[PDB]
Amino acid sequence: TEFIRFSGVVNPRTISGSNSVPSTQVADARIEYVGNGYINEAQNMGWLQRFFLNLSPM
Amino acid sequence: CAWIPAKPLVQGATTAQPIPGPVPVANGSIFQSAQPI
Amino acid sequence: CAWIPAKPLVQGATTAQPIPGPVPVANGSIFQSAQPINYGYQPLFEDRRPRNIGDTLTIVLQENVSASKSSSANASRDGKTSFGFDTVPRYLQGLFGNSRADMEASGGNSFNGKGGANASNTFSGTLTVTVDQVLANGNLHVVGEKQIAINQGTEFIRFSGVVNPRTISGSNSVPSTQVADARIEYVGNGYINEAQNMGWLQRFFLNLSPM
Amino acid sequence: CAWIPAKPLVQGATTAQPIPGPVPVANGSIFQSAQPI
Amino acid sequence: TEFIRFSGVVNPRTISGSNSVPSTQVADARIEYVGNGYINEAQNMGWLQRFFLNLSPM
Amino acid sequence: TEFIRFSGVVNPRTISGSNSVPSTQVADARIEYVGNGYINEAQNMGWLQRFFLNLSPM
Amino acid sequence: LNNMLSQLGITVPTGTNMQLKNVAAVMVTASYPPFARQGQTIDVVVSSMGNAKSLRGGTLL
Q: Could you tell me which residues are lipidated, with the kind given as N-palmitoyl cysteine (chain C)?
């Protein structure tokens, strides 16, 4: 399952004739594209590798 | 991990419910204007 | 097995029997109208849009999302110094003699990091849904489901959302990018679907393995 | 597993039943308008 | 998660007809493009290498 | 983080029609383009090499 | 015109040919009178605003 979430603030005089706004005209743009399932689990780093990436000397 | 609960970037409810408009005042008019800011 | 009794997808009787019409009343008329179910006022030139609970509406699923990102960084440093008095004159032997001032040193340092990510999805098809609620501002909440069973399993395409009536085309159709709370689902069952879940041991390792 | 019951993304009933319109009031009119919001 | 932050001071007579200003006309421009997650963690130097980069003789 | 600082003295009759001046017309021009972070730290000489560059006989 | 048709219940497809001759776009101006009460009537002035030839027998929507 994939989730696309969006939040922002729009100025009405920017809405086109077809009731549409490009996302570059939204003020406090919060965009999110995430997912779940094992396809998403196969893209997190292992806890040991995550620990090493932060605490390894080099 | 992928099982640890994290909060999403866009929080709160992602939907809104339309509210019914006010009851029209019984003057002789068809044009009824809800309270305009 | 193939001998275990299962129920079909389309259940019940798959045929209907016509019923004889009523006996015509003996007025002076040839035109006899069986009891007609009166439906409400219906406009003439307006497009056929759904207006009440139970009306149908075609959704044209066309989804295409694609996001990406990347970044990198690097740094470097070298150094190499040297000095050597090969032949020292006599009057300087007390300061640079016996190679007491020769010098040679080196040093290095490097770093390179980088990363990125991306995601994408598409969807194409057509599905007819039904209005199940009319909101307070005229918007229509729509739900729909289509079930197919081709020879071994069963696939389900479910859809749910909210539609604004002024976006419905002249042929009673809306592209799925104009629906507000779009929930789309394309799943299946049977052993074809079972052959695509990870084994419980591999699923456990994918989450709890150190690397 | 594939046998563990999970709920679908689209929950609830995926169909609706049309409701019969109101009985027309016996004025001299053919045009009958159900209660319009 | 990536963050793009911006701050500055604008002179109104520089805003175009489409309500837009090029960033070279903003006075106290502060621009920031950062991120988090392990993709960002894989771009910081290790503490030992960071120490050596500053205190090594050469 | 990179910093671009500027300071100077301008004669008003040199400002163009678009409110812009080339930097060669500023009197006491002080321009500065510096940075910080480990990318900047990787460009300073080591203290030993800096000492040798000044006090080595040749 | 497409906005009005859509509001009335007719959705014309986009990107289609449409060339009218009996329609003109106008600016309407009026003077709000003192102590005006709702329901009363005033006089308006109608003026063309693009490449129209005449408003001889027109009707203002």
A: 1
